[PDB]
Homo-oligomer: 310 residues x 2
């Protein structure tokens, strides 16, 4: 023919910027942003929250999901077996431990040094040095196995906080007490001052952070949600913040995103919020991965990052 | 006689708690909180902002200043040569690098990840992922030589920020570009996104952070003041925050402390404030130092932490 055709679709990224970087990364490719009504052939598709008509009936060499988190797309494909011929390989971008570390280390220290309290004191123009928290009473509990959790634990134990992790599978991270299964969840929660959620999702963790879990945390605890919005029952979180069970929370993810303006979370004085930016893959990195993987496919070499479509 | 008499005075600490810990640390000592009119002998005096009548005419084996920062007391003694017989040794408690590190690392990351911006966006109930800052453009500049500055630099370069330091004396900290003298101050400021002040004081640094210095920082910079209040010209800081020269500031120290409620700093939305708590010596540590040093003096052994009364 024989030009390589690539199509690109993202709900909120700058298509122009991505099309460009892609053109320079794969100079021998024709890249174009996909728009409704575009049924001209393509060899590779780069997508996030793609509509059905973009991929339905397409013959493609591969689809690249623009982000980690294949749960959303897999369910659209599984609820629409007709959206992507099941023989087409699907890929995902996780090398973002650093980003998580930055976020968690900043906030855990922020809370440890009572900057949240000091900000409230500032807003009342009240000079009041507060009692200091001991490292011993400031235990960190990470929920979730996987590199992100492992990286976050590593970076926090370096500051001397007691660390514990909880997962369904038994684990052995250096300098961390490992708790396993719903059987050991209470023991884990009882001893955790700062609860950090880094669970990849599961049917078995939906709404896991609800009142039944919050009740086992010691009073004056904190919740840092870096995993999935559906892991937190928002009404229960707010109730725990209002009763004093929780001193504070920081949430990067929400049950519904963008979080509707109507949500009271926006309004709570002891909730901090970030619009799902804890760890985004740098486009340069994303582009390097995608171009590298396309090259391996064109040459029949081994690839990495393929998502099994169980 | 022969009981060892110790007297204690602090303007805001819990005298009872300190007297107690002291009694247990030196069981063989009689410790008492000093109150106006108490002219009964003592062997050692533990003080912070002592009034003249507490130390005038006293024969003492040593005075212990309850904190690092001997500038305040030395000037009261030097302006009142009659407050402490000049033959009496004076001691000070610096092993607080960790505390500074916690503070600086938390805040520099806080700013780097735009949590300040995200908080403002939260307060407007506006979901808006913001552009990310590169590490390259997020250079840290530490003013001041000495361990605290060295510790803070060490902990920040570990996160991959470009680091520079400025002092009057030439220095060589690993992984840090060293700038020396007022001659190289502009070059240093021009390249510094986050200015961290850790200068021990000098006549030559009073009001150093004024408009002439702020003007050399790149727009969108930040100031973190962890050293002395008199180092910052508060009116100029506020002006720099209002013009956009400075995106934000965090201050742990102020020209006058407690900062009068009248000060506009309390009121600025892009100033964060803490009541001089960046690095306080743990009382347990303070007590261990003082008891250890008293024991060395009683036994004629070498001591450490003595302040020359030049």
């Amino acid at each position: 023919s024989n030009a390589m055709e690539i199509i690109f679709y993202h709900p909120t990224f700058n298509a122009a910027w991505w099309v460009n970087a892609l053109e320079k990364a794969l100079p021998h490719a024709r890249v174009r942003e996909w728009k409704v009504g575009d049924n001209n052939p393509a060899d590779y598709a780069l997508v996030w929250q793609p509509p059905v008509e973009m991929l339905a009936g397409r013959r493609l060499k591969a689809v690249f999901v623009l982000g980690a988190g294949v749960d959303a797309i897999l369910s659209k494909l599984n609820a629409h077996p007709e959206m992507l011929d099941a023989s087409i390989p699907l890929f995902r971008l996780t090398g973002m431990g650093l980003q998580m570390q930055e976020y968690a280390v900043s906030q855990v220290l922020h809370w440890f040094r009572r900057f949240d309290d000091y900000q409230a004191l500032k807003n009342q123009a009240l000079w009041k040095p507060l009692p200091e928290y001991t490292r011993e009473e400031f235990s960190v509990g990470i929920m979730g196995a996987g590199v992100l959790g492992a990286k976050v634990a590593e970076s926090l134990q370096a500051w001397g906080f007691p660390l514990r992790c909880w997962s369904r599978s038994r684990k052995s991270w250096p300098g961390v007490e490992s708790y396993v299964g719903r059987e050991e969840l209470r023991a884990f929660l009882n001893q955790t001052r700062v609860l950090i959620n880094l669970l990849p999702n599961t049917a078995q963790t939906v709404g896991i952070i609800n009142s039944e879990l919050l009740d086992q945390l010691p009073d004056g605890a904190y919740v840092l949600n870096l995993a999935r919005g559906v892991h937190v029952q928002e009404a229960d979180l707010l109730a725990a913040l209002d009763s004093g069970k929780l001193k504070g929370a920081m949430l990067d993810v929400f049950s519904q995103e963008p979080l509707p303006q109507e949500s009271p979370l926006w309004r709570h004085p002891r909730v901090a919020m970030t619009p799902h930016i804890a760890a985004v893959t740098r486009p340069a990195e994303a582009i390097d991965y995608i171009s590298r993987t396309i090259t391996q496919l064109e040459k029949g070499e081994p690839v990495t990052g393929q998502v099994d479509r169980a």
